[PDB]
Design a protein around this ligand. Structure first.
Ligand SMILES: [Cl-]
Ligand SMILES: [Cl-]
Ligand SMILES: [Cl-]
Ligand SMILES: [Cl-]
Ligand code: NA
Ligand SMILES: [Pt+2]
Length: 129
């Protein structure tokens, strides 16, 4: 599923991401934009052989099991394929764990490079939330 910008903000709100660990909804929308372009099916291989999965590009190196990332952890206790569902619950639950782990949203390289410090409110501008 390819979300619309306000559709995704509403889904993230509904699953309690809005202001989670102090990050406004627009941070999370912006991160999704630049990670996945709002596409729940997005997958990208990393140079280290890990893969990033879903709307938030959660990495098999630490967070989900894909059975092909040697030496990796599965700290969200889920198959990476659960992170590609049209329903964002699993991605949200896992993102909550990631963002709680000490480095906040900087874990998302696209957030750090393209969202951090910008007018992230623009991302939920005009949305009926
Ligand atoms: Cl915001
Ligand atoms: Cl593995
Ligand atoms: Cl959803
Ligand atoms: Cl923080
Ligand atoms: Na893994
Ligand atoms: Pt939820």
């Amino acid at each position: 599923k390819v979300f619309g910008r306000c559709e995704l903000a509403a889904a993230m709100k509904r699953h309690g991401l809005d202001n989670y660990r102090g990050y406004s909804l627009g941070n999370w929308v912006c991160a999704a934009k630049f990670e996945s372009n709002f596409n729940t099916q997005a997958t990208n291989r990393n140079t280290d052989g890990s893969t990033d999965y879903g709307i938030l590009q959660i990495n098999s190196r630490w967070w989900c099991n894909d059975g092909r990332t040697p030496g990796s952890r599965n700290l969200c206790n889920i198959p990476c394929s659960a992170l590609l569902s049209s329903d964002i619950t699993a991605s949200v639950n896992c993102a909550k764990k990631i963002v709680s782990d000490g480095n906040g949203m900087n874990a998302w390289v696209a957030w750090r490079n393209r969202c951090k410090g910008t007018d992230v409110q623009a991302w939920i501008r005009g949305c009926r939330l």
